[model samples]
Target: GDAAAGQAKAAVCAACHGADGNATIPGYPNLKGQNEQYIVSSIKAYKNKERSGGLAAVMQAQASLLSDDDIANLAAYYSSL
Candidate 1:
């Protein structure tokens, strides 16, 4: 996964997840230190409208915008943190 590319694509996610993947809100989860595979799975679940966690709709919208590479890179980026 291209972590550099992930860094660029992750800008849109910063608002909720923070620039470092640590969420500021209680309802939102911190992505930092999360497993790469878990991140990928969760994003895919949201993209497919399978998971309905607290902010599922928002996550689905966000996940919908991602490509497979984007998902991998994003997982790498957050996991690296």
Candidate 2:
């Protein structure tokens, strides 16, 4: 996973997930300093439509737009932060 590549890809995620994986919103969870494997797993769960209801639903669409490499890069980028 290319962290540098993920930085640009994650630009849109900054609105809710924060520029560095820390969410400013009340209900959003923080991803900064999180485990990369876990992050990838979580995102795929959303992409696979296995996780739903509430804010998880939001990630479903976002995750859907991403490919396997995108998810890996995103996890690497966030965990690296």
Candidate 3:
């Protein structure tokens, strides 16, 4: 999934998910070591506003900004972490 490319695109996500995919805040989640497709599915849910979790609006907006390749690469990046 081009984790190298994912590394670049992942910078925007570093704030909440951490540079290494670990979340520093309690309300957010840790992304490190998660499965790639699982990560992809989660973000897709957020993009569609189908997830019931909190921070839906923020996530929806943020997730909507991503492309399908972005999703796959991001998932790969976090999974690699």
Candidate 4:
């Protein structure tokens, strides 16, 4: 998945995380400036039921739909922000 494709796929995330990956929502973490490795790990953790926090269920729901490439692309996109 390309960064452009990740941007498209990440539209739904903009509700919680800003389009630029900086979240305005209080409960959501800002994805911008995050490390790609951390982003991918967190996404995978949510996807595999290994992580939990304020919005764990919601995060898991979104993570469940992501493939490895999707996660990688998303990580790249956010990390680049």
What TM-score would you give candidate 1 relative to the actual structure?
0.94
- Candidate 2 lDDT for residue 22: 90
lDDT of 1 by residue, 3-64 (tens): 78888899999999998899998888999979999999999999999988567989999999
Which rank order by lDDT, best down to worst? 2, 1, 3, 4
Report the C-alpha displacement of residue 44, candidate 2, in angstroms: 0.2
Which pairs of residues collide in candidate 2?
none
Candidate 2 lDDT, tens digit per residue, 6-31? 88789999999887689999999998
Q: Order of candidates by TM-score, top first?
A: 2, 1, 3, 4
- The regions of model 2 sitting more than 4 angstroms off are none
Encode model 3's per-residue lDDT on 46-78: one tens digit a residue.
Answer: 988898556877889889999989999888888
Q: Cα RMSD (Å) between model 1 and the true structure? A: 1.1
Q: How many backbone overlaps does candidate 4 show?
A: 0
TM-score per candidate: 0.94, 0.96, 0.91, 0.89
The regions of model 4 sitting more than 4 angstroms off are none
Over 1-81, each residue of candidate 4 has an lDDT whose tens digit, in order, gives 367777777898888998788888787789987988999999999999898866898899999999999998888888877
TM-score-best of 2 and 4 = 2
What would the C-alpha RMSD of candidate 3 be, to one decimal place?
Answer: 1.2
* Alpha carbon lDDT of each predicted model: 0.91, 0.91, 0.88, 0.86
Candidate 3 backbone clash number: 0
Best by TM-score: 2
Candidate 1: where is the Cα deviation over 4 Å? Answer: none
Candidate 1 clash pair list: none
Instruction: List the candidate 3 regions with Cα displacement exceeding 4 Å.
Output: none
